[PDB]
Design a protein around this ligand. Structure first.
Ligand SMILES: O=C(O)c1ccnc(C(=O)O)c1F
Ligand SMILES: [Mn+2]
Lengths: 18, 429
């Protein structure tokens, strides 16, 4: 699930460290 | 306070202390070699192995190297594999491991460490809370929910478990049920509860049930720095960007994009209509629980700055036209998509996730009556062949009470004050 029109996911990004 | 030295490590505490002193003085390079020397000489020592890992960890931080940090992650695991590891050291080592895995984006790896942590320490409620986060981060809301149910069943006043349970319930559309959990969890003031996600979803759930207190929480979320303002409640933000619910084309600087959309609107329309007629499965129902009622679907050409090649087969001229405007095709925090909405539709008040985009709406098929969009304190209508521009990080709401369908085209652009390197660097949403 992605945050397209809303803020429904626990996190909207997929981070990659530094 | 923490007891980190087993029986043998106490007999070499002088050497262990000397190595750790080098690390604390910022002599990382000397510290790494000193702990490697201690691991060489004392290959079973858990404190020597933890020193090696903490030194790698510091070294990754100094070099800002994910490579160095991945090394530390395995050394933290090595610690837990040794004999006679003291309980406090075992827990610190594996906790730091999970946390650095999460920092790198290894959510399934972090999850496995968290599972192990809970099996090794079955009475530590904080580790169960952390395990619930592990599940949330891989999209496993069903297991997260059970973890927090287990937590609340033994520590029913745990604020962290309450807000997270409330978040899960709200995401499942159990709106009334989520409110007490979200509210009591924030009010608990427990570590981890002062989080914009919980202010955001508590106020949202209240609005959906008619509870007038919703904006009390928006105001408290603003006061505590989670929201730029009461109306602009996005959570993935670059601070300082001009914040305004409605924009003119000239204010955005994307005048050539707007002209292209408006001048070629009938072509954009007609490709969307052809897909409606002959390939309607390309339109997918909106799936973010944003509707009170009604039918709303979208046909997406770009998301996260990536062209959907199959989708563009259905709108080939429109995709070709848009390729000249990287301010939208490269907007990794936006989409390009057709949006169809039918009568009897009401979209709840909601906010998008980021202040880093603006949304253009091009009217394609607009009934004369019944369709309107409110953003913050100003309500507008669409017009066929004309572009509206608003900042969807501000609360907005939509109604469709016409007697036939309404078709628009949504073109998201980078907020115009974002620099080129900002547009290349920001994580995609
Ligand atoms: O199709 C719509 O009417 C619509 C509803 C809600 N939000 C947005 C948005 O662009 O954020 C919409 F385009
Ligand atoms: Mn919206």
């Amino acid at each position: 699930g992605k945050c397209k029109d809303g803020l429904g996911e626990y996190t909207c990004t997929s981070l990659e460290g530094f | 306070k923490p007891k980190l030295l087993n029986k043998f490590d106490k007999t070499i505490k002088a050497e262990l202390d000397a190595a750790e002193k080098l690390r604390k003085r910022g002599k990382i390079e000397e510290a790494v070699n000193a702990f490697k020397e201690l691991v060489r000489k004392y290959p079973q020592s858990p404190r020597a192995r933890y020193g090696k890992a903490q030194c790698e960890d510091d070294l990754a931080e100094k070099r800002r190297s994910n490579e160095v940090l991945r090394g530390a992650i395995e050394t933290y695991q090595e610690v837990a594999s040794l004999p006679d590891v003291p309980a406090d050291l075992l827990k610190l080592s594996l906790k730091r491991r999970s946390d650095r895995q999460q920092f790198l984006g290894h959510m399934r790896g972090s999850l496995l460490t968290l599972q192990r942590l809970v099996q090794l320490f079955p009475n530590d409620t904080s580790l169960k809370n952390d395990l619930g986060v592990g599940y949330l981060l891989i999209g496993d809301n069903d297991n997260a929910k059970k973890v927090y149910e287990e937590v609340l069943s033994v520590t029913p006043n745990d604020g962290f478990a309450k807000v997270h349970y409330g978040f899960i319930l709200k995401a499942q559309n159990k709106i009334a049920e989520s409110i007490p959990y979200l509210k009591e969890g924030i009010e608990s003031g427990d570590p981890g509860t002062d989080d914009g996600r919980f202010y955001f979803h508590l106020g949202d759930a209240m609005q959906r049930v008619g509870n007038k207190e919703a904006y009390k929480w928006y105001e408290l979320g603003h006061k505590r720095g989670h929201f730029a303002s009461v109306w602009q409640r996005s959570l993935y933000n670059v601070n300082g960007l001009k914040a305004q619910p409605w924009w003119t084309p000239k204010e955005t600087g994307y005048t050539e994009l707007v002209k292209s959309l408006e001048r070629n609107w009938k072509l954009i329309r007609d490709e969307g209509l052809a897909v409606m007629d002959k390939a309607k499965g390309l339109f997918l129902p909106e799936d973010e629980n944003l509707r009170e009622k009604g039918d709303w679907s979208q046909f997406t050409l770009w998301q996260q700055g990536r062209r959907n090649e199959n989708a563009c087969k259905g709108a080939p001229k429109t995709c070709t036209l848009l390729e000249k405007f990287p301010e939208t095709t490269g907007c990794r925090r936006g989409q390009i998509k057709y949006s169809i909405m039918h009568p009897g539709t009401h979209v709840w008040p909601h906010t998008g996730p980021t202040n880093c985009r603006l949304r253009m709406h091009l009217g394609l098929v607009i009934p004369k009556e019944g369709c309107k969009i409110r953003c913050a304190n100003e309500t507008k209508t669409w017009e066929e062949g004309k572009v509206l521009i608003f900042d969807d990080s501000f609360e907005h709401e939509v109604w469709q009470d016409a007697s036939s369908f309404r078709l628009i085209f949504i073109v998201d652009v980078w907020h115009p004050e974002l620099t080129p390197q900002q547009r290349r660097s920001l994580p995609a949403i």
